[PDB]
Structure formats: structure tokens, C-alpha cells
């Protein structure tokens, strides 16, 4: 079925005047609210919300009212707060009782600065989920190019009940993955100017595991038939696979296993966990989860063999 059957679109452009630009997302959020009032779960994408803020700035300049920051109206924070808070899981007004939800997915756009602009500064305090761009990753053509250090999602504690019913290990695995990425990021920062000579086996494992994560879990082309849409169960399975690889290597080098030899001896397992992202989600959760269980068992037994 066409997405357009589940889609209505507002098509304001740059040629359209500033007033229409300002009112475009207001019309869009009102439509989203109307469909939420029927119990429908509505997603609203406001691309280039920074252009909306620019429309507000131009209207303010036309009115001559004194702005704040550099050029933007001071009520920018209040208006984005109201617009963002128009979203949320809600109980419909009338009867029978319903439960809709409007999810704002708004796109800011950098203007030379990444976060010093007022629109992002207000949004960070307003919005609950932030996916900040990583300019260095884009410079290296790594997609998606979001930053894993400054981006945040406060729903991680709320989703604990959802995870405990379907994927109970998801929160702790995500925490461990974030810890690995942060530790390896600080270690890369300290090693760029020194060199990898002095790093211990644990440090090398952390660096290479985080590199594997960045190159085979965070990275999605989004165009191939595989991982165009990675389902939550496939994502959880690869999370546990990568964490199993990391902690298996760490436990192996907790013994006398030199990791320089261990990497060569378990290159097969490293390639397997890297290519796990190539599983086709269309196969269904059952068989692909069986594949991931097979991969985990192979990883564990191979690391046990290589430890001795």
C-alpha cells in the first residue's frame, strides 16, 4: 500500500513568503493533532526547522521588534517549546476513550555552527531526544553521520518497562556499548599524539572493538535491501553479538593470550560478527535469531578454543 495513503504533506518552499513558512509547521502539527484525536499514532517530520526559525527572525525584523542572541527573537525558545510540547501520547478529548500520539521528528540545519546557534540551543533544553550531527563522520562519508557523544535520549529510563517485556538485556547492553565507545574515544584522543606502542591488550581491544562497532553496527547505508530498516530484534541481536565479542576478547586476554595473536586466530569470528549486519531482516525474526544464536555459540566456542 502506498505511503501516501498514510501521508499528507505540506510543501512550503523557499519561494513561498515568510508568513507561509512560519505557518507551515503549525498547519502540519494541527493536522497531526487532528489525526491523533482519532487514536492514530502520527509521526510529524518538520524538515529544516531552522528555516522556520529564520522565518520568525525575518518577520521580527520586518516588525522591528528587538531580538535576542544574534538576530533571533527571544520568544524562539517559548514557541519551539510550545510546538514540541504539542506532541506526546495523549487521551483523546471526546468519547469513546482513545489513545493517540504525535511524534515530532524535527530537523534543524547547521549554519556554519553546529550547536552555538540559538535554535539548537533551545531545542536541546526542550526536546527529549537529540541526534546530533558528527561533522567528522560526514567528512569521512560515514552514514548515518550522527554524533554518539553529544546526542542523547532521556526515554532510556522510560523504555525500561518495554525492554523488560521483550528484550530484557537491551538497556545494559546499550549502556555497555556506550561505555565502550566513550572509553575508546578518550583512548584515541590520548593516542593520536603518542602512538599505539604503549597501549595494553585491553586498550587495543577497546579501540578495535569500538572501530568494529562504528564500521559495522552504527553504520547504515540505508539503500541496500539489507539493513534498510533494521528491526529492533535484529538490532538487539547484533548488540549482544558485538558485546559478546568484546567481553570474550577481554576475558581471553585476562589470561595469557596475546591479543596480537588472538586477533589473527579469531579473524573468522571477527568477520562473522562484522557480516552479521548483512542478514536480511525479511527472513523473519525466528530464523535470523537462530542465525544470531549460532553466531554467538560459534564465537564463544572459538574464543574458548583460542584461549588455550
Amino acid at each position: 500500500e502506498p505511503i501516501m495513503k498514510r501521508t499528507t504533506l505540506v510543501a512550503n518552499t523557499s519561494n513561498m513568503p515568510v508568513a507561509a513558512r512560519e505557518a507551515s509547521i503549525y498547519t502540519g502539527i494541527t493536522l497531526a493533532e487532528y489525526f491523533r484525536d482519532q487514536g492514530k499514532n502520527v509521526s510529524m517530520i518538520a524538515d529544516s526547522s531552522s528555516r522556520w526559525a529564520e522565518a520568525l527572525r525575518e518577520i521580527s525584523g520586518r516588525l522591528g521588534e528587538m531580538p535576542a542572541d544574534q538576530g533571533f527573537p527571544a520568544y524562539l525558545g517559548a514557541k519551539l517549546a510550545s510546538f514540541y510540547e504539542r506532541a506526546g501520547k495523549a487521551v483523546a478529548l471526546g468519547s469513546p476513550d482513545r489513545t493517540g500520539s504525535v511524534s515530532i521528528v524535527a530537523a534543524v540545519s547547521p549554519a556554519g555552527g553546529d550547536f552555538s546557534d540559538p535554535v539548537t540551543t533551545a531545542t536541546l533544553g526542550i526536546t527529549q531526544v537529540f541526534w546530533g550531527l558528527d561533522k567528522k563522520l560526514a567528512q569521512r562519508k560515514h552514514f548515518p553521520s550522527i554524533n554518539t557523544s553529544v546526542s542523547y535520549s532521556k526515554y532510556t529510563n522510560v523504555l525500561n518497562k518495554f525492554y523488560d517485556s521483550n528484550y530484557p538485556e537491551f538497556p545494559v547492553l546499550r549502556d555497555r556499548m556506550k561505555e565502550i565507545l566513550s572509553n575508546a574515544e578518550e583512548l584515541e584522543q590520548v593516542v593520536q599524539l603518542v602512538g599505539k606502542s604503549a597501549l595494553s591488550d585491553s586498550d587495543k581491544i577497546t579501540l578495535d572493538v569500538a572501530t568494529l562497532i562504528k564500521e559495522d553496527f552504527l553504520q547504515q547505508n540505508g539503500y541496500s535491501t539489507y539493513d534498510a530498516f533494521c528491526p529492533i530484534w535484529k538490532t538487539f541481536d547484533m548488540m549482544r553479538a558485538f558485546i559478546s565479542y568484546h567481553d570474550e576478547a577481554q576475558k581471553a586476554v585476562a589470561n595469557g593470550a596475546n591479543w596480537s595473536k588472538l586477533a589473527d586466530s579469531t579473524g573468522d569470528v571477527k568477520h562473522a560478527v562484522s557480516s552479521s549486519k548483512f542478514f536480511e531482516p525479511s527472513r523473519g525474526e525466528k530464523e535470523v535469531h537462530g542465525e544470531f544464536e549460532k553466531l554467538l555459540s560459534t564465537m564463544q566456542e572459538r574464543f574458548a578454543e583460542s584461549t588455550d
Binding site: 531580538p67 535576542a68 542572541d69 544574534q70 533544553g125 556506550k178 572509553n183 590520548v190 597501549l199 595494553s200
Partner: protein, 228 residues
């Protein structure tokens, strides 16, 4: 603060005042100041934000005569993780010390993520004593801070000179830092350590070192509390 002042200085209660997200308050200040035709100040904030924060913060402390007190814990968000931003700068210039919640310490899965090194309490001496809290409190705090700093810079050097090149000071400091950030700083969100329980945990964690290596603590305290 009006409610807190009323309670403490008229009902003679000991009131703890907690203000959340002072950054939002500063944004509201910006919006109201720009509502009238007023020239913006540094970083857009009004030029008198110092005076307003002074008015809010000075509504605290003990006063002559009345038996009440006001303890204030304003909480604010750094817009860009920078001290130089007007809100944290003026808050530090007005208040006494500060407590730091660290981004990296939060990402490492430790709660509550208070970063001890950059956080100080400017009036900690008065809170410490014999009748006040417990006798060993200040010395234990100083020793914990010193050991944590040594563990931290030894962990930084881990990647430059290697583990084997470190002294026994640094080995015990890495062990202390791990146990510290995993058991002492790490506290359950619903876990209430009383001050004496916290001191006992700090002692059981500081008992890693022999009494010779505990330099920041006086021997009068070591002969009393080390052996338990």
C-alpha cells in the same frame, strides 16, 4: 524562596531549597528583558542577570535571632558544557563552591555521576567537626580526594608508560579508583546512606592502603579508625 524564607525565619524550621534548571530561568529572563525595548547583553542575556541571581541566591543562610536556616541547591544545565557561559559563571561567582555532574562519568554507567575533582564545597569546614557529623570526616574526605586524583592521573598514564612501569602507589590507586567509582560514588537511586554509613564505606574502601600510605590523614585519626 518566599515560602522557604517564611518557613525558616518565622516557623524556625531548617529548610532545604532546591531550584531546578536555572538555565530555563535565565532563558525566561532573556525573553522578558527583550519583551521591552531593552538592549541585549553578553550572549543575549540581560545585563543585570548578576543582580537577579544575587537576589535569588542570597535568600539563604542562617540569620541572627531566628533559629531557622535556608540551604540552597540551585541546579542548572550548561548550554555548551563550558564554565565561561554567563549562567554557570555568575552562579559560581555568587554561590559557594559547586557540584559537578560529569558527562563522561554518566556515559560510563555510574550514578550518581558526581565528578569529585572539579567540585568543591566552599564551607565544608563548618559542616565538619566532632559533635558536627563525625570526627574523622574531614581527614577521610581529604584522603579520598587525594587518592582519587592519584588514581585518575595514573589511569591517564596507563596508555603512555604501561601498567608495569607504575609504582605500588599507582597500583593501589587504580584498585582504589575502580572500587571507589563502582561502590562509593555509585549509589542506588533509592539508597539512603546516612553520613556515618558513608564514612564507614569510605573507611572500608580506604583500608586498601597501609597506614603509612595515608598521608592526608593525621595519625591521631588512624590510630582510632583504621583498625575495625
Amino acid at each position: 524562596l518566599t515560602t522557604a524564607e517564611y518557613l525558616a525565619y518565622q516557623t524556625e524550621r531548617h529548610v532545604l531549597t532546591i531550584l531546578t534548571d536555572m538555565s530555563s530561568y535565565a532563558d525566561a529572563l532573556r525573553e522578558v528583558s527583550a519583551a521591552r525595548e531593552e538592549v541585549p547583553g553578553r550572549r543575549g542575556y540581560p545585563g543585570y542577570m548578576y543582580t537577579d541571581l544575587s537576589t535569588i541566591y542570597e535568600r539563604a543562610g542562617r540569620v541572627e535571632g531566628r533559629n531557622g536556616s535556608i540551604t540552597q541547591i540551585p541546579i542548572l544545565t550548561m548550554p555548551n558544557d563550558d564554565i565561561t557561559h554567563p549562567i554557570p559563571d555568575l552562579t559560581g561567582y555568587i554561590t559557594e563552591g559547586q557540584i559537578f555532574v560529569d558527562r563522561q562519568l554518566h556515559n560510563k554507567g555510574i550514578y550518581p555521576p558526581i565528578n569529585v575533582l572539579p567540585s568543591l564545597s566552599r564551607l565544608m569546614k563548618s559542616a565538619i567537626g566532632e559533635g558536627m557529623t563525625r570526627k574523622d570526616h574531614g581527614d577521610v574526605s581529604n584522603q579520598l580526594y587525594a587518592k582519587y586524583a592519584i588514581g585518575k592521573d595514573a589511569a591517564a598514564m596507563k596508555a603512555v608508560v604501561g601498567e608495569e612501569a607504575l609504582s605500588i602507589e599507582d597500583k593501589l590507586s587504580l584498585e582504589f579508583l575502580e572500587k571507589f567509582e563502582k561502590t562509593f560514588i555509585t549509589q542506588g537511586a533509592y539508597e539512603d546512606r546516612t553520613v556515618f554509613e558513608s564514612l564507614d564505606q569510605a573507611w572500608s574502601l580506604l583500608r586498601i592502603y597501609p597506614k603509612e600510605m595515608l598521608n592526608r590523614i593525621s595519625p591521631k585519626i588512624l590510630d582510632e579508625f583504621y583498625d575495625r
